Amino acid sequence: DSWDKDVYPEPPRRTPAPAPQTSLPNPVTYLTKIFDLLVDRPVTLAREFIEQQHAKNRYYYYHREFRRVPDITECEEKDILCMFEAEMQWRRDYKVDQEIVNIIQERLKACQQREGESYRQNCAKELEQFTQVSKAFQDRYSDLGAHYSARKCLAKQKQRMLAERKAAKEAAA
Template identity: 55%
Template structure:
């Protein structure tokens, strides 16, 4: 630091921090209550939550990554095997919903392309239109005759 600086403009900090001047000998009740709350409520709850979170993070299953094993179709189930009927029904319903979502996603892509391209969409969106036609054809071929009502009727017939 240069020797010619103004000591009045930049006073030196005190060498030691002064002690707090207490007015009374009684402890602060707010401090006592806050520590009491921390040790009786906050600390146990936080510790419990952290313990549970660490256990759950080890056994974490994300529902949309769940993989179901494939089961036989309803027609392949033995007569009177109600567990097989139920599993085949649930598998068909999952497959049906997945197929519906695939059609929706492809349809949204095609509509976005149509919106983006305007009047020249038939020329510029041929890939999306072709993909949509292919997906809907596959969906209809798989699910044309087996709607949810027909499938429920088959399950009731076999049960």
């Protein structure tokens, strides 16, 4: 398959075997039958023709990979030469994290139709995974402003353990 099953976990489909008892003919079976030899097969014959043509002259393309670069928490103050790599790397991880939330959202939406009337309890795992990701996403990038920058992201984060450690001191008592 083109995509990955681990990224998009699909529970096995439980399709019942057809076992009718009424003597009169079941029409739907016939509609699928006359669809098969009128639409499905001619589509397949054209498809197998394009696929063999595609494999006749196959050209390749790869996926661009960016190596790790020093980010903004160790980049020297001012020194925008180091800030550039820091900012670009952080913004790249922003898009990746946005896609990560997207991947979870489709999985959560996929459960809805997949589980039908069982959606409420069957995929509570999907709900908590999104809840865990969404909460963590909020601590990462939420309320960064329309002019968000890695400096602000570090600034917002640095407040988080500031309050957390202050709470830790209070909790220790």
